[PDB]
Amino acid sequence: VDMYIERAGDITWEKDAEVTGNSPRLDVALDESGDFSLVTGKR
Amino acid sequence: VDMYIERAGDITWEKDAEVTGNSPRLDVALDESGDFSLVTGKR
Amino acid sequence: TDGVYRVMTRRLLGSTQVGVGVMQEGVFHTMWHVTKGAALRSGEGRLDPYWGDVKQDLVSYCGPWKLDAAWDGLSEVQLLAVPPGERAKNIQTLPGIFKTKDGDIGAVALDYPAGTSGSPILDKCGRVIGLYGNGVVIKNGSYVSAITQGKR
Amino acid sequence: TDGVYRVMTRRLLGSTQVGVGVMQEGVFHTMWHVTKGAALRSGEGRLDPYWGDVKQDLVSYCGPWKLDAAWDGLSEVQLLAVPPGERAKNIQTLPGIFKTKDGDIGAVALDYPAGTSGSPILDKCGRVIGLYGNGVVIKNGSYVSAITQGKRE
Ligand SMILES: [Cl-]
């Protein structure tokens, strides 16, 4: 494998950043493979 | 010599971005090698 | 050097982003499924995995897991999304929760494509409270990622 | 495929950013001194230079120079700096002017390290009015870059 890392930038909080997304309450299950289920998920 | 390109992002104007830098007024000379002088400059 | 990193792979057509990671205190943090324990090239040479949890989908390079900040359960957080071929962006959101039969875990309803996994999630002080990219796809096709944090 | 790109080089250990470029209308634009006419691997395969000018320090891949926007001579501009190992940043500034015995060119007093050359300078509408990274080091050590723009033909 020829996998590598390259620095993308500093890690900072942004004042006045765009606010998006809801706040869901989800019944989920997590298996031994690290995969969540609902009662692929990996990006 | 083994150069390549990777996409870095969209080209957009940023509303109320950081404003800095002076407004200079410089007499310069540009030679056949593309190098400016004052009367390296390449980054 | 501390900061957020793109996990890339060498290709004939240049490179391809397979994930994202966080460097803090000389330790590189990303998602297990991003690298699958493979060694990583870097400007400082080879980096080797030090700790891994397949179920947590986490992996640590050069040292033990260093990230420890936690979501308070009340406040808004920011995802520092580093998507493939796109510009890094801060997205603020109020997290939801994964209601596991084994406890509760915060979750952000922010949808980003494969290769963004490992992007840091921050608190108002800028500490990484977790990594993005392991979650579920909801019935409407949207993606909800857990705020995955390891044990320090 | 339009956008700003990092120009990288394969190293023994990993990779190193040598410059920046602009993709527009199927043509890749950067500074001559970044690539020196070398071919570029890319998502579209090998890219070969189509037009070059060492004196202007510009080079074009896959087609003739396509960037045509010009600085107003009055208005503020934005540098989309893409520095090595750093996140892309917009910096708004009011350009100065380089005076040549043969004409005038705008110049931005924004200082960014080697490897940022080729970063686009934009107008309010988002068009590349020039590329960053060719200029002079001023007596106080700071860097002033010309707004280098190519003839389009
Ligand atoms: Cl960025």
Numbering used by the authors:
A (entry chain E), B (entry chain A): 49 to 87, 127 to 130
C (entry chain F): 19 to 170
D (entry chain B): 19 to 171
The study reports:
NS2B-NS3 protease is responsible for all cytoplasmic cleavages including at junctions between NS2A/NS2B, NS2B/NS3, NS3/NS4A and NS4B/NS5 proteins and within the capsid, NS2A and NS4A proteins. Similar to NS3-NS4A protease from hepatitis C virus, the flavivirus NS2B-NS3 protease is essential for the virus replicative cycle, and thus constitutes an ideal target for antiviral drug development. The NS3 N-terminal domain is a chymotrypsin-like serine protease with an absolutely conserved catalytic triad His51, Asp75 and Ser135, while membrane bound NS2B serves as a cofactor essential for folding and catalysis. Here, we captured the active enzyme in one of its native states by determining a crystal structure of a heterodimeric NS2B-NS3 protease from ZIKV in complex with its own NS2B C-terminal peptide.
We designed a novel construct of ZIKV NS2B-NS3 protease by removing the hydrophobic regions (residues 1–44 and 97–125) of NS2B from the native NS2B-NS3 protease (containing residues 1–177 of NS3) (this construct is hereafter named ‘eZiPro' to highlight the enzymatic cleavage site). We observed that the NS2B-NS3 junction was cleaved during overexpression in Escherichia coli and throughout purification steps. We crystallized eZiPro and determined its structure at 1.84 Å resolution. The eZiPro structure adopts the ‘closed conformation' also found in other flaviviral proteases bound to inhibitors, where the NS2B cofactor encircles the NS3 protease domain. We also observed a NS2B-NS3 dimer interface, which is unique to ZIKV and is mediated by a set of polar contacts from both NS2B cofactor and NS3. N-terminal residues V49-D58 from the NS2B N-terminal region form a β-strand within the N-terminal lobe of the NS3 protease, while C-terminal residues S71-V87 of NS2B fold into a β-hairpin that inserts into the catalytic site of the protease, and participate in binding the substrate. Remarkably, the NS2B C-terminal tetra-peptide T127-G128-K129-R130 makes specific interactions with both the NS3 protease and the remainder of the NS2B cofactor. Notably, the side chain of R130 extends into the S1 pocket by stacking with Y161 and forming hydrogen bonds with D129 and Y130 from NS3 protease. K129 from NS2B forms hydrogen bonds with S81 and D83 (unique to ZIKV) within the S2 pocket. Overall, the structure of eZiPro captures the post cleavage state of NS2B-NS3 protease.
